[PDB]
Nucleic acid binder design. Structure first.
Ligand SMILES: [Zn+2]
Ligand SMILES: [Zn+2]
Ligand SMILES: [Zn+2]
Length: 85
DNA sequence: GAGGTGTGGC
DNA sequence: GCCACACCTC
């Protein structure tokens, strides 16, 4: 399958796209750049940039349907939702 | 909550 | 490659 060949790392992935992303941990490549005025943050993964942009926007797409609380990530909500039952 | 990351449908 | 789920660790 898709093995990392950097300095005997050996980590293996199921898709080449996963391997490509993992290789950035060795190269320091960060292709996803925040465009927020004044911010120069960059990230190795698109979804990391999405998390960063929500720091700028305060956007909380995941509203709990049993109380007022909202969250930036679905896993945060899923954990909270357990406390309603 | 936040960061890091393995994953898979499309 | 995009995107978001899901899990671990702090
Ligand atoms: Zn590697
Ligand atoms: Zn930014
Ligand atoms: Zn709630």
């Amino acid at each position: 399958t898709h093995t990392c060949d950097y300095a005997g790392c050996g980590k293996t992935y199921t898709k080449s796209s996963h391997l490509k992303a993992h290789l950035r941990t060795h190269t320091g490549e960060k292709p996803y750049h925040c465009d927020w005025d004044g911010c120069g943050w960059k990230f190795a993964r698109s979804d990391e940039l999405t998390r960063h942009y929500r720091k700028h926007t305060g956007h909380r797409p995941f509203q709990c349907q049993k109380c007022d609380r909202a969250f930036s990530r679905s896993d945060h909500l899923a954990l909270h939702m357990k406390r309603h039952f």
